[PDB]
Design a protein around this ligand. Structure first.
Ligand SMILES: CC(C)c1cc(Cl)cc(C(C)C)c1NC(=O)NS(=O)(=O)c1cc(C(C)(C)O)co1
Ligand SMILES: Nc1ncnc2c1ncn2[C@@H]1O[C@H](COP(=O)(O)OP(=O)(O)O)[C@@H](O)[C@H]1O
Length: 472
């Protein structure tokens, strides 16, 4: 408790903001994945040592992990349960760099010489918050071994995290892993009696709460939330807190002008393009090269030399303003969905690489699933679909549009080489491309239709596709 006080003081300062935390709006969380309360996550139904939080990209995994850190450090959360909470941001943990569990803990500390032998003294009093398992750069398979049992042994990041997840390293330490549903396949086979919880995002009421927290003027917030209520697609899409942030930020620029507020967006691509147009040109190519470079070479954090290579001298005021975020020399995109957006846009620009190579590594953990790169370029390729359309190549959009139909034809009726794309994921892809002549031709490749509906967003996307396969 001599060091515990010093440590909690650091946690109260580091997790003070989202990157204040007075914008935090309660998230819907469901056990047996039944709404759970955070204090009761580790309380048994024998003791609960591992808790997995599944959650779609932009649902708030990282925000809830930081709110957990801040609340614990304030003395509200797990007051009597944990002496130490270590936040492990997976985006930064090298799977190849040899490190010990000791160095991993020492990196979560303010001072250069922490009492690691004192911290490790009571392992049941430690809770490790592994944030964003899906964000681990490179491959991560079950075959990784031999498993480590020495917290001071330097092993590569994959053996280190595999041993910590399988509860071989500090077996009675508590673990909280947050992941995108896609990556759950890799993780499921390491997990020892996990308690699964599903992050469901905002309710219709807490969607309204977000809008009123964001627009500090009630009169602005009410008029900004009215646009979301009038639009079924935006209302539905807004259970995702990132979508709420994106919509709100765009409606702020539009708010400055005397032009009546209106967002006619019907697809995720159109939402992202509405956001990109609010913050608007010459630096739009360099952003795409940097994003698609990171997608293929597993780079989520971009050093000053990477931006130098991609001609971002420019990123000082323009890109850092709302498209980039400085961290800890080290800059990353506002979100990985935004990285996957520029990665897809890169393919559709008049001067782009081969689209067929991307589809070869779709659903592969190593490449990064590529869910939003594919899903975005289905909507971007859309001939019906901005100021950005002039920059997009009218010609190469048709070349990709034909390759996408050949791919959807293969995935629709083939022995699964990977779990992804699931039939629902293909429906999300098809929802982005709204062209009925494309969507009808694509729906003919489906032998059986699989309803696996979880959210009212899944109902929206799937009902759209099902309607497009009547076949007279
Ligand atoms: C709620 C999901 C479907 C969502 C909807 C929108 Cl409109 C926008 C986004 C991003 C662009 C902000 C996301 N988020 C993810 O799609 N996340 S995910 O992890 O890829 C994923 C894949 C899946 C299924 C489909 C079941 O396979 C679930 O979660
Ligand atoms: N509970 C929340 N309250 C307010 N904003 C939130 C909340 N959860 C997420 N957000 C918004 O979502 C954005 C990114 O969310 P994040 O936690 O990184 O999701 P994930 O890590 O699952 O991809 C934040 O910039 C923020 O504006």
């Amino acid at each position: 408790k001599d060091y515990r006080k010093k440590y909690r003081k650091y946690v109260r300062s580091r997790f003070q903001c989202i990157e204040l935390n007075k914008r935090y709006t309660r998230l819907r969380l469901i056990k047996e994945h039944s709404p759970i309360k955070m204090e009761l996550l580790f309380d048994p139904d024998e003791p609960v040592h591992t808790v997995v939080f599944q959650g779609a990209a932009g649902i708030g995994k990282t925000i809830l992990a930081r709110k957990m850190m801040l609340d614990w450090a304030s003395g509200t959360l797990y007051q009597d349960r944990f002496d130490y909470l270590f936040y492990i941001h997976c985006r930064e943990v090298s799977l190849v760099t040899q490190r010990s569990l000791g160095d991993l803990i020492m990196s979560c500390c303010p001072d250069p010489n922490p009492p690691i032998h004192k911290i490790v003294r009571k392992p049941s009093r430690i809770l490790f918050l592994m944030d964003g398992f899906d964000e681990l750069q490179g491959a991560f398979d079950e075959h990784i071994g031999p498993l480590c049992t020495d917290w001071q042994k330097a092993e590569r990041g994959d053996i280190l995290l595999s041993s910590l997840i399988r509860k071989k390293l500090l077996p009675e330490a508590s673990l909280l892993i947050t992941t995108r549903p896609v990556a759950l396949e890799k993780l499921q086979h390491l997990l020892d009696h996990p308690r699964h919880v599903e992050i469901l995002g905002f309710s219709e009421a807490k969607r309204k709460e977000y809008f009123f927290k964001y627009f500090s003027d009630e009169a602005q917030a009410r008029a900004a939330f009215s646009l979301i209520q009038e639009n079924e697609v935006l209302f539905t899409m807004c259970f995702i807190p990132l979508v709420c942030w994106i919509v709100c930020t765009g409606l702020k620029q539009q708010m400055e002008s005397g032009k009546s507020l209106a967002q006619t967006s019907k697809t995720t691509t159109a939402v992202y393009v509405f956001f990109l147009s609010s913050l608007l040109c010459a630096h739009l190519w360099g952003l795409c090269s940097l994003a698609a470079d990171g997608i293929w070479n597993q780079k989520i954090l971009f050093e000053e030399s990477d931006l130098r290579n991609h001609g971002l001298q420019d990123v000082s005021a323009f890109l850092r303003m709302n498209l980039f975020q400085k961290e800890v020399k080290f800059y990353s995109f506002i979100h990985m969905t935004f990285q996957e957006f520029f990665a897809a846009m890169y393919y559709l620009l008049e001067e782009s690489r081969d689209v067929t190579v991307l589809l070869e590594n779709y659903g592969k953990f190593e490449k990064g699933y590529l869910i939003f790169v594919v899903r975005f370029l289905f909507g971007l390729v859309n001939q019906e679909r901005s100021y950005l359309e002039k920059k997009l190549s009218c010609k190469i959009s048709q070349q990709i549009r034909l390759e996408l139909l050949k791919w959807i034809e293969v995935k629709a009726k083939a022995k699964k080489l990977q779990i992804q794309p699931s039939q629902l994921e293909l429906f999300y892809c098809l929802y982005e491309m709204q062209e009925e002549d494309f969507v009808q031709r694509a729906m003919d490749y489906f032998p059986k239709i699989e309803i696996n509906l979880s959210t009212r967003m899944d109902h929206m996307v799937s009902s759209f596709c099902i309607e497009n396969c009547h076949r007279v």
